[PDB]
Each structure stands twice: as structure tokens, then as C-alpha cells.
């Protein structure tokens, strides 16, 4: 119940609107807590919450504390954090609950409270907090961890974004406004905080900054400036100055550290504040701290559930911190092979800019861990940085960087020559910039290893990126990645998407796909709160039917489903194409195997190959009707409208057995082509023990009879947590395996280590 | 996605605040739909909702309809309702979804839309009937042959929540009075905030008035009467919050003439809605369609609030609500669908009010019987309970009509801040109510043939079963056969619920053939009981100590659970050490002795018909060896320190006992229940995603749901669904049949056998006079 006192819209609104001298707010903190719990965790049976709150008040009163941030943080810290061996650590039995808490609350206040009220032996702040197990620590020391999936909030944890926003409040406000005009965002803001708006966003950021300044004053114990008396209502802090009597006083003060917005500075200030408030605290200032914590947690929730603030990460600072953080606190790095994913810029200048920043941050990180003749002691250009980096040997002391540009897929627009024409364009320009960079500096092929296409699945199919990936392969880009199976209108649709990626993308031996959740999630736990009928687009429906037919043709036990899929596919094609003649499932298959062709090749230097790739097709005398049908599929306005049309499909359209058969067919294809799956920990899972990673790892009770191993790799990407790490996810998997599956530490370590080593085996780094 | 357009706080607020001539509200209906879906069904993965809404707009546009109540109702009706055999029915494959929908939307508009846009043969004059059932010849034949038996009907009075809407419209100021007197209560403020944040009594009143005014206006257009002139002044739905509209200087009332004498009846509502939809068959004015939308939204919001929850109930103290109850329990045929009906009512603390309620119930029953049999009735117009009983003595149990068995409640309330012993004032109020009941039974001995049972319902945690034992014993002697007591419904822990059921068994005077209640604690599995629960649950120290003692008692003899028994004993001794502030040593044996005396009346000897249990403690105080248990129990009852420690809270791990141990405790309680031949009334009800996970199937012994060491327990049926509008015993019977046939693969015959066994348990364990 402690999380609802640190993350609550109702509590924030109430505390920020009433005066600072109101006193006696217990009734209201309690009511707001129940509202927050109903809004967030609805399934609590309405009396467990009452009892938990009663126990919380009982603990506070017995320990002679007041309901407030200090007491809540103390309780959380005593319950989760200790001291063991080196620095604070989390209980092994409590790590899962700690992760769930981290999805709502920031860890820095809790660690400050632990350092104040239960310090270890007579610490530099480090996030996140890990558990301790000698087997896991020895394995990490010996083999190190390998990162293959880091693309969530840029590549930094959401917790430094709070301080970045406080540093650039007007950049953050600019981004929020430019994106609040977007519907997606209005809906998200309403779902988190109904009455948010950009104006209260700005006011909350300013209130947080002013509260931070005031509480820094009391943390240092400096004289409580006089204008504090005029401060009566927290809304007064929404502004850059306070008016006491005629005068306008600023909230700024002096800070010890040069960077006052750094997490070290935040930790120092919080530790000092809690040390001064060890025994008690003023009610008003404690409420100010409460409001600051609530604002921070609300901002982090909004951020995790989501260009410019990202542009501000285009210096050799965010990347240097990234590499220093991937490296542990020891001499030898915790992370050996790091894949760094960045959005490619449409401006050659901005692209050169981003890449110079990344490479120079990496070089500085290396210079802080090895001493050598660096040629250019102060590199200024990518060429100089590469001259520096050529001297670095893969000894294994530090991280080894492999850069992977993204490709963001956007939804098709109202009017274009063919679907995703403008998107394919923008991708073309980005790829052109990348290829010109690789040309003008061939050595950049040793650091740019891979083109990943992330973003929403439904916005662009895999077949759209095939020409781009082929051209990049020739421009010198080894290894390809493509997000598949993450979000799908239907499980069959996701499995079909993975199969299309396999049979259309130029994935070679050792390449990695992505999440591939559609072939890991079971049909049993995929339809748990879903409506009995799901609506999809006609194009996806037809492609799914064709895929079902293709995969269940040879299955003696599923021939009925294959035949029904064929019949439905022919029918749906009959309207989608407005065909008068008869089209068989065979010719439908022929039509849909040509999706990998470039649209503007021959049916609508390095690009020449796939400009003429269609000529072979148009040469084959028997490929008439597939060709004309595909041209209708691409250009015909009627066919495009019918493609965007929607149709309903039953949830049990195919039985669990048939869905598992399709999943296992895709599994077999993946194993045959030796394609790995980067699986980070992520809606339908109540508990982490239901995650499909365990099915893939082959745990008894989770693996299905006809499953095939698939070379799972690890990735540090948790959509809804603050301050996550590769070590954190490794420890989470270890804890789940040891406690929920009963595996011994050695067996659990073997299972997690196999995935981790898959990261190294299927790394994109230059050998 | 159609439910979010008929039940949505955001949509209601938006539609009721913007002007009636705004036009083009699709963007906003869509946004509000997504907000409503996030608030209600959060687990939809944020794109299934987008796609469903896109398909909905596609259907509306293709069928040339406008986004509005008419289109939504038409879609729902085509999707769920048909015509088969007699009247409209629901698909067998669609009945589960229809029930889930009924938890949010009222069925009357949908049935009106079905009757308008897809009527059955024009030979069966359709009279509106709720609820809509599926059709299966096996189930219908079974119902015709054996009839259905009701053993649990105490939820919203005893009527469906859907007639309460019209009752509120009939008595808006009674409903407003109740809402205000109860909005001062915290429980209620929290509930109102959780349903509609900015509800307040004032907007409650305004919404009721808006609904009434919209009903009047739409009745005018349903009859097609001249659209009175003041409609032009009506520009903003908030104008309808008031009893009159001001056009130019004048104040015009919204009332009009209605065909039927009772304009607030469900027949009148159905007629008006059918006429309105017939007139709007092809199109509708945007403003009036929005008024209908607002009316539907207000009705659904009110029903949601009502189902999730004295005076409006007092207004059910005439021989009308009970007559309708009996007519509804009786089907539309000559022979009643329901054979043995148990009627549960709250006993009044005023002898006048109690006589009043009972005369109303008995006279309603007599009128219902008079409408189905012709006989010499002695008093053609009974005025007193004696005359009604003279009438009813002539009725033979032929089986044509319902047979009534009345069961007074006993509402348990939380203990108050200061009293002699816990629940002293509650035990008092129960004492006065029981005294009134006994004086009634005296002054009319024939009332023992109609008052058969004293049930104690209400919240479990507010009063333990041991508090009602003296009351039940005294009532048993006053002539009250059969006893009932709600147990296992809500518990801080599963062990606590199982312990509560065991305490009810070993303390209440439950004889052979008695029924307990829900008893969910011994039906819900430990696997699906901890699914969204925190790893630590906090309880009171008294419950913790009693649970530890119960664990020890039940796992003493279990060779595989001796470790858990020993740990429970040790923890019990420890917790007793502070709770009692004891300096000496107290063993688990003497703790058991202390806690077996909870059935004693507090004010017997340690603090006419009551004489027996006033002296029941004398035997205890006579036993020379019962010293330390007695003094310890006296400390437990009176000591302020012990009472504060009892109210204290302590945390218990969710996996304090393994699933195996919890199942062992459940099966021990099962064996006790089977040995004492105590039945369980199980109505359909938080941790179940789908109905197939309900514990009724475990009790019925379905493969995959029953556990190895389970014991059959004589489950009876009850029509009590906490979160549905317009539910029935037939509806629940059909729901069980559908689940058994579709989700468990059982043939119609096997499913009918399984449901029929529970239904027949209702008759076997009936409280009716033989
Ligand atoms: Zn990803
Ligand atoms: Zn009940």
C-alpha cells in the first residue's frame, strides 16, 4: 500500500491545492489512497486494501512517525533494502516485489532513506539495486553480460530523464506541447492524469524545481530565507519567483556540486534532508517533499508509458554515462558486448553529429580505463575518433560497442501512390545518408553493424523493408534486425508476421529478429481478457488465411482448418480484388509471394538490382495473373479501400492445437535458418512466471510437446519500469527460476547463461 | 465495444454538458469510449480497442446509420437476440457474453429494439418479460417437470435492479433522501468516487430530473404529439435538470399524458421505447437521439451504482412488490416455473413495522394465489395477518403455484468504539428484533408455518458466527425451524474463511438439513485465490490467533502437515502472550479450551426462553478444572488491553500455508459439512476471469476442477448475482447449463443431470413446512 502514497494523481492534486498550514490530512490521504488503488490495482477485494492501510497507520503510530514521505520511505527501505558484502542490496525473495514497485516509484529516495537510517559499515549512489548471489556474481565476473536490445527511452533509464526535464524544463514543455496535439497522446494523458494539460505540466515542473531548491536550503541548513513565510499554497511554486511584500524573490540557491541536476546531487540533497528530518520534520516542508516525489513519479509514469529532448542527448555525455553505467564499479566491465541502437537522422549533418557524439563518448569511456598512445589526444572528427579506436584491442576489459541504426515505421497516409510510399521514401533518404557516411568513411563499417527496424508492427509490414535491407547489405551493413510479434490483432496474425519476416527479409545465418512474442505466448494465456471477436483489416485477414493454409496443408490432423482457410481466403480475395473470374488459393499464394518486390521496380547504383528484380518475374510467361493481381493490390484505389476495411474474426477461429502447430512451424523455420530471438522482459501476464521466455528455455510445465529451441538472447528493455539494467533482468530471471520453478542455483544459472551466451554468439560486433 | 457507448461516465458528462445543436460529436464519442474502456476493462491491449471501434463505425456507416443509441441498440439486438419457438431468446453460444453485458447495460432498450427491427411472428402478442433466456428443450422440459427452487434471494431487497430505476423515477425525492442519508458515510463516498468521481447528491438529483424530463419529452414524440413549442428554448441538456422550462417569461412543465395508468411501469417504458424506435426506424433528430442517449447513460450509471452498493426499501412494504415478485417467479404459463421460494427480509426493530412488512408479504402471496386458483376464500378481502392466514390455510401443496417460506435476516454491524463487550450493542439490536419476532410468532402460532428460518447475512468481518448462537438457540425454541448464516464470502485470508466456516459449524445450532450460505472459502482454490493479492495480507490479531488455533486443530492428525501444526501452535502461544498480556505459560490446549467458549452468551454468568443460555455458563463454572480458560475468556471479553490488542493488526504471508495444507483444511471442513449434512447455497458471483473458474464446478465434481480429497456437500442454487441487472433463477440455471455444455464438453443430458442435482438439493433442504 506504500506505493499509492508516492504515486497517486488524487493525492498529488489534493496536496498541491490545499494550503501548507492545513494540518490533519490523514482522512484525505486515506481516501485518495483508496481511489488510487481502485484506479491502478482494481482487483484488490475492497477490504484487503482497508486492512493494509490500517496496518500501515499502525506501524507509523507505533514507531512514532507521522504519515508522510519520510515514514513511507523508511518503511519501504527497511522492507526491501539491506547491507550485504558490498553496498545495499535487495532480498532475493523480495526482488520480484521490488521490480513491481520500481514500475511505480523511483529508487533514489528509498536508497537515500536506507543510507540515512540503516547505513552499512563506515557509498556512491548507483542504480539500480540488485540482489546478491555468489553464483550469479561469479558468472558475471567470468563471462560478463551481453546487451542485444536497448532502444526504449533513447537508451537511458527513465529516472535520469526526470533530472533532464528539470534541467531543460522548457525543452520538455516544448516536446509535451508538440505531441499533445496528437490524439494518441491526449488519450494517454487522460488515462494517466485526466486534467493534465500542457499548462499544469509546466506548473508541475516548476513546482518540482522550486521545491528542490527550497529543500536543498534546509538540507544544507541555511537560514530558511524570509520569503518562506509568504509561501502558503503549493501553487505559489508554479512560478519562477515569489512575491513576499512588493518584491519578487527567486527560488534559486547555491549548490555544492557543479552539476546541480545530477543524480549524485539529488542523492546528496535527499540524504541531507532525511538526516536533518531523522527524528521529525516540519509539516509544510514534509508536504513539499511529498509533492516533489508525487510529481516525479507521475512524470516518470507518463514518460515510460509513452524528439527534441532526445536531440539534447546528441552530446558525448549521455553516451559516456551510458558506457560508464554498462561498466560496473569495478576495473573489468560487467557488460562485454553492447549493442547501441539509435534513430537515423534525415539530415546528413545531424547524422554525422549523432555518430560523432556516440563514438567520442565511447572513446572517452575507453580512455578512462586504458592508457595508450592515442594519436589525436583531442579528436574533433569521426575520422580522428576512428583513428583513436583502431588501436583498441578486444582484450575484454571494457565494453565493445556495436551501433545499430533504427528504422521507424509510420502508418500509411491518406493519399500516396502505393501503401507506405512516403514511409518507404523517408527510409530511403535515411538509408542513403547512412550509405554515404559508410562510403566517405569505410572504417565506420566496423562500428555500424546492423540495421534494425523497430516501432509499431501494424504500421508497416516486414515486406516493405526488404529492398532497403538488401541495398544496405551491399552498402556494407552486416546483420539485420526487425521487430516482429510484439503487437498483433490476432495471434495467427503475429505468427504470420514472423513467418513473413523470415521468408522475405534477407536474414542470414546468425541474424536476430526481435521480441517474437507471437510464437512464445500460448493460446491459453493470450485470450484472458480479450473479446470473443477481434476485428482486423481485410489484408491481414487474407494473409493470415493464406498462411494458415500454407502451414496446415501437410498436417493430417488439421486438414479441415487448412481447407476452410483456403475457402475463406478465396472468398475474401473475391471482394478485396473485386474479381469476377475464379482465383485459386495457389494463385493467391503466387500473388502474395511477391510482396518482397520493390513497388516501383518495374510494376509501378545499388538500387539497380532490386529495380530489375521484377524483370525475372515479368519474364516468366506463367506469372501473368499473379502479376496483374499484385499490381491491383498495390495501386487500385478500390483494393486499397478494401484492404483498409475491417472484418471480425472469432477468438477461437483456430483451436489451441492449431495455433500451437503454427507456432511450432515458425519455430522450426527459425531453428533451421539459425535466427535468434532477443527476448526482453515485458500485458496478459499476471506474474513473471507466466512469461514465454521460460517456455522457450524449456522449463517443465511451460514447454509444449512439439516445441523447437530457438537461440534466445537477452535484452535490457522493460517497458514499464524505472532504472532497469541488464544485470537487473539477469537477476530477475535467476530469482524466478530458483524460487518459482524450484531450480537449484546451478541449474538456474545454466539456463540464464545459455541465453546470455546466445547474445555473444549472435553478436553483431566486428570479429 | 458497444457497452462503452451505453455505460460511460465520460460520455454522459460530455453529452449532458454540450449544447443540443453542436452536431458532429464522433471524435468525442470515440475518445470518451477509449477512456471508459481504460477505466473499466483495462487489460485490452490498447489496439484491440482501436480496431473494435473502427469495425463499429464501419458497420454503422455501411448500414447507413448514425452513431447513436438507436444504431448501438440495433447492433446489440441483431448480435444477441432472435426469435425462436416462443418470444425472443438469446443464443446458447452468446448467453455468457449477454450476461457480461447485462452487468453493464439494461436489457429493456435492447428488447424494444429487437421487437421493432426484427419482430417475431405476428401471432404471439409479445408482453415484455425480463430477463431474456436461451432455449434448450432439455432444460425447458426439466423446468416444466421439476420446477426451480430458490434458496438465496437477498440482494437488492429481492427485486432486480432494473425496476429500481423506475422506482427512483417514481420517488425521485425518496431516492435522493436515501442517497444523501448514506452519502455522509465514507464507504459510500468512496464508492461514488470510484464509479463517478464528481457525482455528489446535487448532480444525482439533477440526473434523476433530467431522466424524468427526457422520458416525458420522448414519450411525446413516441406518441407523435405536436412537439410542444417550448422545445425550441431547450438548448442545453442541463436545462432538463429542473421541473419546469422557461421559454419566454413563462414556466412550462414537462409532464404529459400517458396511456397506461402506471406511467413508471416497465410495460409503459417498453411501450414508449418501442414507439420511439418505430418512429425513428429510418432516422432520428440529432437532439432527441442525444436525449435518448443521455437517458440510457443515466439509467445505466444509476443501475451500476445501485448494484455496487433503507427508505426506498420501506417503500417496498406494500402488497405490490411482493405480488410482482411472486408473479415473476411464476412464469408466463399456468404452472409456476419456481416451486419452492425462500423470501428473505430484514426484521424491523419496531413491532408495528414488522407486523406491517409481514402483512404486506402474506397478502401479496395470497393475491398471487387468488390469481391462479378459485376457492372459497373465507375473507374475500383480508385486512389482518390472522385473516390472511385463515385464507392461506386452505391452500394445498398441489404444485401449481409458488410455495413461500419466509426467512428474516439479521444484519451484523461492526463493533463500536465503547461497549461492555465486543458487539454488545449489535447483540442488543438483534435481541430486540428477535424479541419482536418471537412475540409475533406467539400472538399468531400459525406464522410458524410461513416463517421458516433465521438467516444472518451482511458483512462477515463485522460479527463472528459465535455471536449469533444464543439468538439462534432461543429462536429454535420460540419455534423457528432451520437456520442459515453467511460464511466464507469475504475473509482477510483463505485460512480465515475456512476457520469461519468451521466455527459456524461447531458453534451454531445447525441441525440435519440446515444450510450455511456461500461458503466460498472451501470452494475457491488456493491457486485461484491469490492472483492479484499482495504477498502479505494484514488481519486482526484475534483472527490471526483463531486461525492458528484452527490450523493446529485440523493438522494435528495429518502426518504430512505436522510441521505446520507445530508452527501454528507455537505462533498461537506467542500471539496469545501479548494479546492476553500473560506473564505465565499458556499451552495450546488451554488456548483451545478458552476458544471453545465463544458460543457462550457474554452476559450469562461471566459478565423466559433466555434462561437456558443465561445459565449455560454455570456448567462451565462448575467444572473445577475450567478455571484458567474461564478467566482468560473473561479477559478476552472485557479487558480493555486485550480488546485493543484484538483490534490490532498483524501481517501474514500469502504462502503462510502451502496450497496442499490449505486444501487439507478445506477438505476437513468439507468432511465436517458432509457428516452434519449441511447444504451450501451457492449463487454465481472477483478473482474469476471466466465463469468456468467458479468453485461450483469443483463442488459438482467436474474433471479438472475437483481435487483428489474433496467431499460432496449438497450444493443448492440461489438467484443472487451481485453485479447484474435483471437476473433470475432460470437465468442462472441456463448459465450453468451453458457453461457445462460448452466449456466442459458435457452433453446436454449430463449437464442437465449435474445442474438438476443442485436444483433438487434446493427442494431436499427447503425450509418450507411439510
Ligand atoms: Zn523492442
Ligand atoms: Zn448471500
DSSP characters for B398-433?
-SSS-EEEEEE--------SS-SSTTHHHHHHHHHH
Cα–Cα distance between B500 and B518 in angstroms, integer? 12
Of B305, B111, B299, B95, nearest to B215 (Cα)?
B299
From residue B438, how far is each of A303, B476, B479 by CA, in Å? Answer: 66, 10, 8
Residue A326 CA to chain centroid, in angstroms? 17
Tell me the residue ranges of DSSP E strands in B592-741: 649-653, 680-682, 715-717
> What method was applied to determine this entry?
cryo-EM
Name the grid cell of B424: 454488545
Task: Say if residue B425 is preceded by a cis peptide, omega within 30 of 0.
Answer: no
Query: Residue A98 in contact with residue A135, Cβ under 8 Å?
Result: no
Which among B34, B48, B490 is the nearest to A45, CB-wise? B490
Gaps in chain A (C to N over 2.5 angstroms) fall after 122, 306, 604, 682
Distance (Å, whole) CA B605 – CA B620: 10
Query: Hey, what's the cell of B82?
Result: 432472435
Residue A335, φ and ψ in degrees, nearest 5? -110, 125
Interface test mutation site (partner B, options A9, A76, A535, max chain B beta carbons within 10 A): A535
- Chain B interface mutation, best of A55, A62, A525, A575, highest count of B Cβ atoms under 10 Å: A55
Buried b (16+ CB within 10 A) or exposed e, B190-211: bbbbbebeebebeebbbbbbbb
Are the C-beta atoms of B575 and B544 separated by less than 8 Å?
yes
**What pairs with residue A337 in β-bridges?**
A146, A400
Q: Do A51 and B492 touch (CB under 8 A)?
A: yes
The cell numbers describing A760, all together, are: 555473444
User: Are A646 and A539 contacting, i.e. CB atoms less than 8 angstroms apart?
Assistant: no
Cross-chain residue pair B193–A535, CB shorter than 8 Å: no
With contact defined as beta carbons under 8 Å apart, do B81 and B90 qualify?
yes
C-alpha distances (whole Å) from B489 to each of B345, B461, B517 are 19, 10, 9
**A600 CA to centre of own chain:** 34
How far apart are the C-alpha atoms of B168 and B268, rounded to whole Å? Answer: 15
Q: Report which secondary-structure segment, H or E, holds A637.
A: helix A637-644
Which of A288, A273, A278 lies closest to A63, judged by CA? A278
Closest ligand to C-alpha of residue B455 is 2
Nearest ligand, measured from the Cα of A679: 1
Chain B's closest residue to A45, CA to CA, is B686
B30 to chain A: nearest residue by CA?
A187
> For this experimental structure, what is the resolution in angstroms?
2.1
Q: How far is B347 from chain A (nearest CA, A)?
A: 27
Q: Do B651 and A44 touch (CB under 8 A)?
A: no
Strands A241-243 and A145-147 come out as: unpaired
Distance from Cα B521 to the centre of ligand 2, integer Å: 14
A→B contacts (Cβ < 8 Å), by residue, are 1, 31, 34-35, 38-39, 41-45, 47-48, 51-52, 54-55, 58, 97, 183, 186-187, 190-191, 458, 487, 489, 528-532, 534-536, 645-648, 683-684, 686
Q: Measured between CB atoms, which of A187, A648, A686 is closest to B34? A: A187
Ligand nearest to the CA of B460: 2
Tracing cell 510529481 back to the chain, one arrives at A295
Measured CA to CA, the distance from residue A648 to residue A651 in angstroms comes to 9
Distance in Å from the first CA to the final CA of chain B: 51
3-state SS class at B287: helix
Identify all chain A residues contacting B521, using CB atoms and an 8 Å cutoff. none
Query: Is residue A41 packed enough to be buried (19+ CB in 10 Å), middle (13-18) or exposed (0-12)?
Result: middle
Helix (H) or strand (E) holding A716: none
Distance of CA A764 to the CA centre of its chain: 20
Q: Are A543 and A496 in contact (CB under 8 A)?
A: yes
Q: Is A35's CB within 8 Å of B534's CB?
A: no
Residue-level length of chain A: 767
Quick check: A51 and B186 CB within 8 A?
no
Helix, strand or coil for residue A676? strand
For residues B38-57, one letter each, b for 16 or more C-beta atoms within 10 angstroms of the residue's C-beta and e for the rest, the string is: bbbbeebebebbbbbbbbbe
For B509, residues 6+ apart whose C-beta sits below 8 A from its C-beta are: B469, B472, B473, B476, B483
Q: Do A400 and A336 meet the contact criterion of CB atoms below 8 Å apart?
A: yes
Q: Are strands A480-482 and A451-453 parallel, antiparallel or unpaired?
A: parallel
| Rounded Cα distance, A693 and A732, in Å | 12
Partner residue facing B689 (CB), from A52, A528, A534: A528
Beta-carbon contacts of residue A482 (< 8 Å; ≥ 6 apart): A452, A453, A462, A465, A501, A505, A507, A513, A514
Strands A248-250 and A241-243: antiparallel
**Inter-residue contact A397 to A333 (CB < 8 Å):** yes
Instruction: Indicate yes or no: CB of A646 within 8 angstroms of CB of B689.
Output: no
- A536/B52 Cβ within 8 A: no
Rounded to whole angstroms, what are the CA distances from A676 to A479, A513, A547, A688, A714? Answer: 12, 6, 22, 22, 10
Report the residue of chain A nearest B47, measured CA to CA: A489
B119: which 3 cell numbers?
Answer: 419482430
Question: What is the distance between the alpha carbons of residues A701 and A694, in angstroms, rounded to a whole number?
Answer: 9
CA distance B30 to B570: 60
Is residue A482 a contact partner of residue A453, using CB atoms and an 8 Å limit? Answer: yes
Contact B69, B289 (CB under 8 A): yes
Q: How far is the CA of B483 from the centre of ligand 2 (A)?
A: 14
* Phi, psi of A216, deg, nearest 5: -65, -40
The nearest alpha carbon in chain B to A2 belongs to: B534
Which CA distances in Å does B715 have to A261, A325, B756?
65, 62, 11
Where helices occur in A577-636 by DSSP H, the ranges are 585-592, 608-611, 613-619, 624-635
Q: How far is the CA of A340 from the CAs of A330, A349, A384, B19, in angstroms?
A: 22, 20, 21, 54
d(CA B740, CA B752): 9
Instruction: Give how far A299 is from chain B: nearest CA, Å.
Output: 19
The full DSSP string for B160-204 is -HHHHHHHHHHSHHHHHHHHHHHHSSHHHHHHHHHH-TT-HHHHH
Smallest-distance ligand from the CA of B154 = 2
Pairing of strands A533-537, A646-650: antiparallel
CB A300 within 8 A of CB A718: no
Q: What would you measure as the largest C-alpha separation in chain B, in angstroms?
A: 91
* Span from the CA of B518 to the centroid of ligand 2 (angstroms): 6
β partners of residue A679: A714
Question: Closest Cα partner for B498 from B481, B480, B470, B521?
Answer: B521
Q: What share of chain B is helix, strand, coil (3-state, %, to 5)?
A: 55, 5, 40
Backbone angles phi, psi at B154, to 5 degrees: -145, 25
Residue B713 backbone dihedrals phi, psi, to 5 degrees: -140, 10
Our CA angle for A749, A751, A753, nearest 5°, is 65
Measured between CA atoms, the residue of chain B closest to residue A457 is: B47
Question: Do residues A752 and A730 lie in contact, with contact meaning Cβ atoms separated by under 8 Å?
Answer: yes
Q: Supply B557's cell numbers.
A: 492428525
- Distance, in Å, from the CA atom of A634 to the CA atom of B257, rounded to the nearest integer, reads 62
What separation in angstroms does the CA of A595 have from each of A76, A460, A604, A626? Answer: 55, 12, 13, 11
Nearest CA in chain B to A194: B35
Is the CB of residue B698 less than 8 Å from the CB of residue B710?
A: yes
Write the DSSP assignment of B237-268 as a string of letters.
Answer: GGGGGSSEEESSS-EEE-----SSS-TTSHHH
Which residues, 6+ apart, have CB-to-CB distance to A293 below 8 Å?
Answer: A6, A69, A106, A109
Q: How far apart are CA B43 and CA A43, in angstroms?
A: 12
Q: What is the CB neighbour count within 10 angstroms for residue A575?
A: 14
d(CA A274, CA A281): 9
Q: Which residue of A has its CA nearest to B189?
A: A31
The three three-digit cell numbers of residue A117, written as one number: 537510517
Q: What cell numbers appear for B604 in the block?
A: 450469562
Amino acid at each position: 500500500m506504500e506505493r499509492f502514497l508516492l504515486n497517486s494523481t488524487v493525492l498529488l492534486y489534493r496536496l498541491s491545492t490545499v494550503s501548507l498550514d492545513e494540518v490533519s490530512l490523514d482522512e484525505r490521504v486515506e481516501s485518495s489512497v483508496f481511489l488510487a488503488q481502485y484506479e491502478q490495482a482494481r482487483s484488490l477485494p475492497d477490504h484487503v486494501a482497508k486492512s493494509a492501510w490500517s496496518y500501515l497507520v499502525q506501524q507509523i503510530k507505533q514507531r512514532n512517525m507521522k504519515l508522510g514521505p519520510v515514514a513511507i520511505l523508511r518503511l519501504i527501505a527497511e522492507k526491501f533494502i539491506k547491507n550485504e558484502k558490498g553496498g545495499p542490496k535487495i532480498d532475493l525473495p523480495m526482488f520480484s516485489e521490488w521490480q513491481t514497485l520500481m514500475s511505480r516509484v523511483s529508487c533514489l529516495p528509498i536508497i537515500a532513506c536506507h543510507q540515512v537510517f540503516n547505513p552499512g559499515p563506515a557509498y556512491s549512489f548507483r542504480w539500480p539495486l540488485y540482489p546478491y548471489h555468489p553464483t550469479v556474481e561469479d558468472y558475471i565476473t567470468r563471462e560478463c553480460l551481453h546487451e542485444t536490445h536497448q532502444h526504449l527511452n533513447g537508451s537511458t533509464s527513465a529516472e535520469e530523464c526526470w533530472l533532464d526535464a528539470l534541467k531543460h524544463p522548457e525543452a520538455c514543455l516544448r516536446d509535451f506541447e508538440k505531441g499533445w496535439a496528437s490524439q494518441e497522446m491526449k488519450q494517454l494523458c487522460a488515462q494517466i492524469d485526466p486534467s493534465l494539460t500542457p499548462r499544469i505540466f509546466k506548473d508541475r515542473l516548476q513546482i518540482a524545481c522550486n521545491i528542490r531548491e527550497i529543500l536543498c536550503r534546509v538540507a544544507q541548513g541555511v537560514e530558511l530565507p524570509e520569503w518562506i513565510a509568504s509561501m502558503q499554497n503549493p501553487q505559489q511554486l508554479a512560478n519562477s519567483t515569489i512575491l513576499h511584500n512588493g518584491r519578487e524573490y527567486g527560488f534559486a540557491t547555491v549548490w555544492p556540486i557543479d552539476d546541480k541536476y545530477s543524480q549524485e546531487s539529488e542523492f546528496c540533497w535527499l540524504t541531507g534532508l532525511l538526516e536533518k528530518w531523522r527524528f521529525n520534520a516540519p509539516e509544510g516542508l514534509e508536504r513539499l517533499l511529498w509533492i516533489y516525489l508525487l510529481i516525479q513519479n507521475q512524470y516518470l509514469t507518463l514518460l515510460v508509458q509513452r524528439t527534441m529532448t532526445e536531440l539534447r542527448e546528441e552530446t558525448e555525455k549521455s553516451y559516456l554515462s551510458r558506457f560508464k553505467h554498462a561498466h560496473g564499479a569495478g576495473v573489468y566491465s560487467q557488460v562485454r558486448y553492447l549493442e547501441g541502437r539509435f534513430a537515423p537522422k534525415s539530415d546528413p549533418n545531424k547524422m554525422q553529429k549523432l555518430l560523432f557524439s556516440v563514438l567520442r563518448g565511447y572513446w572517452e569511456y575507453l580512455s578512462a580505463h586504458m592508457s595508450m598512445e592515442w594519436v589525436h589526444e583531442k579528436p574533433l572528427t569521426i575520422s580522428q575518433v576512428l583513428d583513436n579506436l583502431e588501436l583498441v584491442e578486444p582484450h575484454g576489459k571494457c565494453v565493445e560497442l556495436a551501433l545499430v541504426p533504427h528504422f521507424i515505421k509510420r502508418k500509411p497516409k491518406n493519399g500516396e501512390a502505393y501503401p507506405h510510399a512516403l514511409l518507404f521514401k523517408d527510409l530511403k533518404n535515411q538509408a542513403a545518408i547512412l550509405m554515404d557516411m559508410l562510403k566517405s568513411e569505410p572504417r565506420l563499417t566496423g562500428w555500424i553493424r546492423g540495421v534494425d527496424a523497430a516501432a509499431n508492427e501494424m504500421h508497416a509490414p516486414p515486406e516493405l523493408f526488404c529492398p532497403l535491407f538488401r541495398v544496405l547489405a551491399k552498402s556494407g551493413i552486416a546483420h539485420f534486425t526487425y521487430h516482429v510479434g510484439e503487437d498483433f490483432p490476432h495471434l495467427i496474425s503475429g505468427i504470420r508476421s514472423i513467418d513473413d519476416a523470415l521468408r522475405f527479409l534477407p536474414l542470414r545465418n546468425g541474424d536476430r529478429l526481435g521480441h517474437c512474442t507471437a510464437i512464445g505466448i500460448t493460446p491459453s494465456i493470450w485470450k484472458r481478457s480479450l473479446p470473443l471477436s477481434l476485428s482486423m483489416t481485410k489484408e491481414t485477414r487474407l494473409l493470415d488465411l493464406v498462411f494458415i493454409w500454407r502451414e496446415l496443408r501437410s498436417h493430417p490432423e488439421l486438414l479441415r482448418y487448412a481447407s476452410d482457410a483456403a475457402i475463406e481466403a478465396v472468398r475474401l480475395a473475391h471482394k478485396v480484388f473485386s474479381l469476377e473470374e475464379e482465383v485459386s488459393i495457389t494463385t493467391l499464394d503466387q500473388v502474395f509471394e511477391m510482396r518482397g518486390l520493390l513497388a516501383e521496380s518495374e510494376g509501378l547504383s545499388l538500387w539497380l538490382e532490386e529495380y530489375e528484380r521484377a524483370r525475372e518475374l515479368v519474364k516468366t510467361t506463367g506469372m501473368k495473373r499473379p502479376l496483374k493481381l499484385y499490381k491491383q493490390w498495390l495501386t487500385s484505389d478500390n483494393v486499397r479501400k478494401q484492404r483498409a476495411e475491417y472484418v471480425e474474426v472469432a477468438l477461437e477461429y483456430l483451436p489451441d492445437e492449431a495455433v500451437v502447430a503454427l507456432q511450432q512451424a515458425v519455430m522450426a523455420k527459425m531453428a533451421d535458418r539459425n535466427i535468434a530471438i532477443e527476448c526482453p522482459p515485458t500485458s496478459q501476464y499476471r506474474n513473471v512466471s507466466e512469461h514465454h521466455i521460460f517456455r522457450w528455455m524449456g522449463l517443465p510445465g511451460e514447454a509444449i510437446e512439439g516445441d523447437v529451441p530457438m537461440s534466445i538472447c537477452l535484452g535490457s528493455d522493460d517497458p514499464g519500469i524505472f532504472a532497469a539494467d541488464l544485470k537487473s533482468e539477469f537477476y530477475h530471471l535467476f530469482v524466478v527460476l530458483t524460487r518459482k520453478f524450484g531450480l537449484s542455483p546451478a541449474d538456474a544459472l545454466r539456463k540464464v547463461a545459455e541465453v546470455n551466451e546466445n547474445g555473444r554468439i549472435y553478436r553483431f560486433h566486428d570479429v
